[PDB]
């Protein structure tokens, strides 16, 4: 789903070397796109809840 | 560490001296708890249990009545746990 920013995490892993723990810039990208994707999934559930209230009035 | 025959008698006498119920001057080693020392019928079971806690814990129910004297109890505990060679 993320695709673009998720591929950047593998780029840091490709040239990782000894002491591979020091990679924060690529790890932050995975926490940005997936959080927006989870919010988009939450927005779809909120839209269904709002539609049920309008349908009950008619 | 191995246990000595002279050391085991001194260890048993040290625990009996700090018992508070029995006098340190009246009884030493040769004097029996049954007649010489002022000990109750229920008191002998409590004194034998405390002696087992310090050394190797082994006390039979049938052999509890036979052991009363501190000199006899020190020999019975050493023989059962295999001591002095």
């Amino acid at each position: 789903y993320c695709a673009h920013y998720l591929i950047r995490f593998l780029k840091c892993k490709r040239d990782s070397f000894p002491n591979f723990l020091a990679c924060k810039h690529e790890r932050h990208d995975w926490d940005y796109c997936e959080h927006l994707d989870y919010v988009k999934r939450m927005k779809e559930f909120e839209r269904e809840r709002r539609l049920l209230q309008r349908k009950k009035r008619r | 560490p191995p246990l000595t025959l002279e050391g085991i008698k001194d260890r048993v006498l040290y625990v009996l001296k700090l018992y508070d119920k029995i006098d340190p001057e009246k009884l030493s080693v040769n004097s029996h708890f049954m007649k010489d020392l002022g000990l109750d019928s229920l008191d002998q079971v409590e004194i034998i249990m405390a002696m087992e806690d310090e050394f190797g814990f082994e006390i039979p129910d049938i052999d509890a009545e036979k052991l009363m004297c501190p000199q006899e109890i020190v020999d019975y505990i050493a023989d059962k746990k295999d001591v002095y060679e």
Binding site: - | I59, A64, E65
Partner: protein
């Protein structure tokens, strides 16, 4: 016997007390409380009242009977090494050792041979002394002690000699 049944229960009650309490100072507090409970009935001798208390002694004790009691180290039954740590070797296997290997360390073999010769000679005298005891059936409860001082060895010789060493 009435005296033995009280002592057997009192010995169990003290060792079962340290399972409930954690600290040794709290153990001594409850130990004095148990003494006051039994001394009230110990003052007078009874045939009906004391026997009623003996069956009553099983109650209360059985209500708190299983908190997994402590047997401490190597104890008859219980937990944590009852027959373990001591594998041991029988005395019959000692004489079974073949030559060449038996030649190594001759101090242990020669001393054991002297004790074996003494045990063989005393066996004939011990057999007559065992049947000399007045019963005229076979035996009564426990084995009888030696009367003779010159011959020595009270009935059994291999009972105490050569057992087990940890």
């Amino acid at each position: 016997t009435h005296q033995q049944k009280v002592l057997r229960l009192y010995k169990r009650a003290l060792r079962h007390l340290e399972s409930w309490c954690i600290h040794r100072d709290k153990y001594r507090y409850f130990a004095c409380l148990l003494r006051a409970r039994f001394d009230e009935h110990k003052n007078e001798k009874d045939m009906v009242k004391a026997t009623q208390l003996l069956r009553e002694a099983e109650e209360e004790f059985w209500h708190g009977q299983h908190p997994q009691p402590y047997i401490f180290p190597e104890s008859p039954g219980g937990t944590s090494y009852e027959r373990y740590e001591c594998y041991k070797v029988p005395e019959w296997c000692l004489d079974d050792w073949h030559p060449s290997e038996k030649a190594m360390y001759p101090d242990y073999f020669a001393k054991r041979e002297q004790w074996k010769k003494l045990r063989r000679e005393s066996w004939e005298r011990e057999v007559x002394x065992x049947x000399x005891x007045x019963x005229x059936x076979x035996x009564x409860x426990x084995x009888x002690x030696x009367x003779x001082x010159x011959x020595x060895x009270x009935x059994x010789x291999x009972x105490x000699x050569x057992x087990x060493x940890x």
